Amino acid sequence: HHHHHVINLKELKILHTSDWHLGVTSWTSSRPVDRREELKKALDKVVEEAEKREVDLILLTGDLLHSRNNPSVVALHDLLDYLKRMMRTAPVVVLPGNHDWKGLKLFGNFVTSISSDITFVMSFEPVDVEAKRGQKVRILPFPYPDESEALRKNEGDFRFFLESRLNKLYEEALKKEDFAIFMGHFTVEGLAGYAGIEQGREIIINRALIPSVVDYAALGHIHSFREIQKQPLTIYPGSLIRIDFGEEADEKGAVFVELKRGEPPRYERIDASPLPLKTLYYKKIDTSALKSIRDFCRNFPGYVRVVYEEDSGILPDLMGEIDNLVKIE
Amino acid sequence: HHHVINLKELKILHTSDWHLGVTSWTSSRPVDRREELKKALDKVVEEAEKREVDLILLTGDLLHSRNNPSVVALHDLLDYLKRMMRTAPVVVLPGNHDWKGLKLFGNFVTSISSDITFVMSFEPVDVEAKRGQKVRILPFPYPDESEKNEGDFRFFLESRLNKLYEEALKKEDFAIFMGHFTVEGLAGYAGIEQGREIIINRALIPSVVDYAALGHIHSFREIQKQPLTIYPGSLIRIDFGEEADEKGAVFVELKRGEPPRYERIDASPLPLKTLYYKKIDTSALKSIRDFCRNFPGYVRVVYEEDSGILPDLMGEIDNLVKIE
Ligand SMILES: [Mn+2]
Ligand SMILES: [Mn+2]
Ligand SMILES: [Mn+2]
Ligand SMILES: [Mn+2]
Secondary structure, X not given: OOOOOOOOOOEEEEEEXXXXXXXXXXXXXXXXXXXXHHHHHHHHHHHHHHHHOOOOEEEEOOOOEOOOOOOOHHHHHHHHHHHHHHHHHOOEEEOOOOOOXXXXXXXXXXXXXXXXXXXXXXXXXXXXXXXXXXXXXXXXXXXOOOOOOOOOOOHHXXXXXXXXXXXXXXXXXOOOOOEEEEEEEXXXXXXXXXXXXXXXXXXXXXXXXXXXXXXXXXXXXXXXXXXXXXXXXXXXXXXXXXXXXXXXXXXXXXXXXXXXXXXXXXXXXEEOOOOOEEEEEEEEXXXXXXXXXXXXXXXXXXXXXXXXXXXXXOOOOHHHHOOOEEEEO | OOOOOOOOEEEEEEEOOOOEOXXXXXXXXXXXXXXXXXXXXXXXXXXXXXXXXXXXXXXXXOEOOOOOOOHHHHHHHHHHHHHHHHHOOEEEOOOOOOOOHHHHHHHHHHHHOOOEEEOOOOOOEEEEOOOOOEEEEEEEOOOOOOOOOHHHHHHHHHHHHXXXXXXHOOOOOEEXXXXXXXXXXXXXXXXXXXXXXXEEOHHHOOOOOOEEEEXXXXXXXXXXXXXXXXXXXXXXXXXXXXXXXXXXXXXXXXEOOOOOEEEEEEOOOOOEEEEEEEEOOHHHHHHHHHHHHOOOOEEEEEEEEOOOOOOOHHHHOOOEEEEO
């Protein structure tokens, strides 16, 4: 199943998905919920769409695995399974998120060398790939600065380092052939309604420093769908599930992007239809609140957290009674 | 692949037991064996290219660390795999290993490339060689434990081998057994017992295969002729005790209706020597210094009678790696 060769082809169809967090079990400290079933249902939906829409290229922009250090065998198996499924649809380019195990890097470069349908980008060096219908795409990758996960330098020099990398990618973008695509794994500065670091050291990038001459800027790391800017089109697809409370109002899913030479890019969201989350708040846990909790959870198809401040004595066994109540705090 | 189809002939590069990553004599004078090992591997790769082999067989213990291979060792492994894949399709039968990441890696890679196949179960796999020859692989790795009663375990192993024999009978062009174990009753074998060993009678190896590729034993050994069963051996002399064996790979040529033939590809490894002395005296001290001076390999001194504090032999002798 090799690439097609279409002459004078000015179109490129892209599936961009990110932040899978394969392996995640949520609320381990109160009621562990393995998110695998829900997550795979979403991934199957995304794979089916890429097939339906006959995409030319698939972009994976990191945090595909929940465990940055020691992913389980099941999570790794799921990842390789979906990578394989995607490769059968269109060539895949992978920009993994922050990781520590060298196993992914060794694996990545080897697999890239032996197959024309997958490319791992794990440095700042540009890569020229070929899409499903023969389109030439220059990839401009910006991963988490490795080795120096500890900066070993002040904020001024480090910012200048990041800024210098971005200027270099800009210059390399100018030497493109058909299309040029930026792939980044970081936090855009000044994100509207952004919670904060989910237990990690963050790389903060001003959106204006994203090379303006690229056709699409594919970003990952942020769990909410966000259209960052239009020139160049810069998007976080978001995660596929609602990973924790705080993500109740987010849009979750992937994106379909259509590029045409000489024309503005267009996109459509591929919504994951994730299970919903709800936080219930009460001044005090009384019979009025106690019935409010039971009532709500009864017809709610997602997971519920209860927060209350005032002491109410020994609570009744709500969690043993309500299967979708995953936390009381 | 080419599409002759060669049907009648099949040329095989069989190499094994590389032990990438090994540093020897760490508790006396560590010697990183990588330079020597890569020199041998380059020679083996060069030969596969020169001989234009159709199929390359790797039969385990390619990495010295069964649990935690270093990055350099894994990099070297993947480096050589890629080089070999450019020459001919490669079939890999991993040895006794842990981590399991090797297994996830293996099956994925096998799926995405038609130039490499990892066999990590007892299930037969049908592969296609360089010139389109249809090869059936009958793999026999270390079982995943298991290891209850020695009678039922031996019977379990025996049942696997009969199974392989049966599915061998299917075939098409050629059939090739790949095994990682210790043949029973090996002449001059040390150390036995290990005792983390899988012992198999050579007569239990499916007689209807064209070639039986074995790994785990560090010495070249033609085990039997029908079917031709060979341990290629390691590529370097890993420790003292391996002073006398042959190291290298094997080139095997199969022809339908004809008996199989083979030629060794010798690694020309660095030599090893153990020097024995009743006691360390000036006449012994003389022979040690003089021997090591013109010896291109590594030397061990073993002495019986205690001769007090020794002169700095290892400090003045670069290739003396052990005294005991
Ligand atoms: Mn994430
Ligand atoms: Mn991230
Ligand atoms: Mn060995
Ligand atoms: Mn072995």
